Amino acid sequence: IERPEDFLKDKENAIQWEKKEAERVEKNLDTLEKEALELYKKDSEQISNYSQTRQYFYDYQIESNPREKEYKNLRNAISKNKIDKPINVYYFESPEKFAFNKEIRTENQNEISLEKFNELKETIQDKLFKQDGFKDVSLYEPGNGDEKPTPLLIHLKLPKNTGMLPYINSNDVKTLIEQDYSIKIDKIVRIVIEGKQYIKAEASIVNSLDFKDDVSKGDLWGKENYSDWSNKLTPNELADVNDYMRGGYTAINNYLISNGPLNNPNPELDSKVNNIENALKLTPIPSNLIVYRRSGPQEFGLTLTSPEYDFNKIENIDAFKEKWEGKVITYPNFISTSIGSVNMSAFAKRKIILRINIPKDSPGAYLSAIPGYAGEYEVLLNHGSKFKINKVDSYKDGTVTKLILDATLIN
């Protein structure tokens, strides 16, 4: 191995090695992949932005989008070169990315008051932040002369077989990766560059299965882990689960939401909730997995008429963030989610997307593994589940702005 795991401050060696690696990897690229790279160096912004929200449209809108072809080829290009050993990378990020919607400091100021520091630390302490899309990173710590866009510097360790594309831009070398994981900030320290103070954050990666728009693959994973689930259930448990899916969900979830088990107990309904809950514990989720849910306004105390529901006006986004960002919401009812991220008719009008990170071994079941329910790619989560809303983002779907809530199931 002619390479360390981290070049640290050795800019000269990092560049010499990366320039060599760029020439080596270029030999494994197609005409189509090369072209995709050329489009990137021509307009990083557009491609990057597209790579972040691509999977939320209708399957057909994704397939026919002019940029989709570019995305796929550039993505293939990156996967072509999987590193044989771990490596650390560096890149500047905006504090808002981690729900810190205030400035750490200004360019004018050189120091960062302890007040800000501790506030950032408490904000991005122990939370999982999902990262998506293409990103340019550096193989050495930004020093003098280097571009320093923000006061927040991230130091990330990329696992062994992570895709990485080193390439020569104009005269210098750059590195391209595609984020497809969640980040964790293990530690932050104050450092000084060119006489100015910056925050360096030590980050770690946490992997999760996220099928995004590839529902076929998701369904395959679901069938393989839950095709025999029904056989593990007692006759009474299967009966209640079938009852639920067949239409019983209405009475049951209304009973739960109106808090009937304490305000108007119904033994026959309590029995069903119990059996379904037990059914969801027979085969806990086999690994970290991301699921999606398009929520109606009522789930967040709103109505299709509420003025706060119009996210086209930023004041309303700021209001929504102030109320929910960093908070935890509880669902008394069982919550159905999809392993797929794509939009579906009947959900076209919903403007809130709940992107949930479910920990390995959490209760839950892929209901769509039961014949007769193919088309929903449904993962049902247990009633009373709690979700911590880490970060709130937005994107435009046509003329309507929608929100994506990066959340994590906690229990």
Ligand SMILES: NC(=O)C1=CN([C@@H]2O[C@H](COP(=O)(O)OP(=O)(O)OC[C@H]3O[C@@H](n4cnc5c(N)ncnc54)[C@H](OP(=O)(O)O)[C@@H]3O)[C@@H](O)[C@H]2O)C=CC1
């Ligand atoms: N939602 C999804 O993304 C997915 C839906 N499905 C399937 O779609 C079909 C129906 O879906 P959908 O209508 O979303 O189902 P839900 O049964 O979850 O929604 C019923 C309605 O009740 C409201 N509601 C749900 N949970 C709460 C809560 N905790 N607090 C207050 N109100 C709540 C919503 O109000 P609202 O309209 O008024 O504001 C929603 O319109 C089912 O067969 C389901 O299995 C499958 C996978 C995913």
